[PDB]
Structures are given as structure tokens and as C-alpha cells.
Amino acid sequence: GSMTPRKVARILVAPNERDAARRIVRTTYEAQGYAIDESFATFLEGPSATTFGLFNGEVLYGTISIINDGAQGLPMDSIYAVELAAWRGEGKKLAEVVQFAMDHTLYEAVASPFEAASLFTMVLTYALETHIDYLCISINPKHDTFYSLLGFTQIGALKHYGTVNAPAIARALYVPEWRSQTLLAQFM
């Protein structure tokens, strides 16, 4: 599916779609040597979470979720709590984008995060509709430079993320003026 492609990005609602989303995350993280923790699944079946999916002609190949700052906090809190405390004091709506995974076997890849562009648009629209102030991410240092181009400013140092047993930096983006934080906005 690359010369007659059909890519569908939508909210995952059916229990079997969410199981399949968890399966992609599980396989992807095991291949990259990340640990799978049951805390992420907990957050996702909670009220303040939303899972998106990416379909190659009806088979799911990619997924991304977003967790809203509620009474259960954010997964970031175990590592980057005090980096968020200032914003929480000012009464800022925060949300963490989480469990982003693509299965490279199910999509004719570039041989790459920019092939999840439609998943990102869905996260961005959600953030502009929910009236979210700061969109937070904790990412593997290898994609650090990519998300910096996307306009995410570094808010946390390079630490060890115990949940994943892998290194992480924290980045955040001010959604209400996202176009002023990204270089790609010069081309529109």
C-alpha cells in the first residue's frame, strides 16, 4: 500500500481496536528495548485519556494517545513533576501526549515520525478544541531534534525514565500560539 494507498486516522473506540493499539505499543517497545509498564494501560482506560489510531486500509499500524491533567496527574509526574508544578499553580490546562507507536512491518515505510503526520493533526486539533495550554512530551533523546523543529521547547533535563527503563527529556508546546514556536510556520 504505497502506490494505491489508503491511510485512515481516527479515534479508537472499540475494545478490540484499543487492544490492537496496545499490541503495537508492546511490540514496538520490546523491539527498541523499552520496558512495558501496566501504568500506561491504566491511564488509557481512564476518563481523561483518548487513543487515536492509524489504519492501512483497515489494519491498524500506528497509534497515539493523549492524557488530560486530572486527579490522577500525568505519567510525566514520576520524573518531571516539579517541572510542571509552576504551570499547575497558574491554573494551566496540561496534557501529555503518550504511547506513540508505529509498526514498521505493516506500513511501507520511508525507512520515521513524519509518517504519523495525520495522527499529529488529530492531537493538535484535539488540543485546540479542548483549549489545552501546554502539550507535554517525554521522548527518547533520538527524536529530540525532530520535536524541537515541531516547536516543542525543552522543559526537563535528560533523566532516566524508570517506567520505561530508558533515557528521556521533557518538552512542551504552548498550543494557543503554536505557529510562533515552529520554523515550519514561515512556509504558510
Ligand SMILES: CCCCCCCCCCCC(=O)N[C@@H](Cc1ccc(O)cc1)C(=O)O
Ligand atoms: C503540534 C502537535 C505535535 C504532536 C506531536 C506529539 C509527539 C508525541 C511523542 C510521544 C513520545 C512517547 O511516546 N513517549 C513514550 C515515553 C518514553 C519512552 C521511551 C523513552 O526512551 C523515553 C520516553 C511514551 O509515552 O510511551
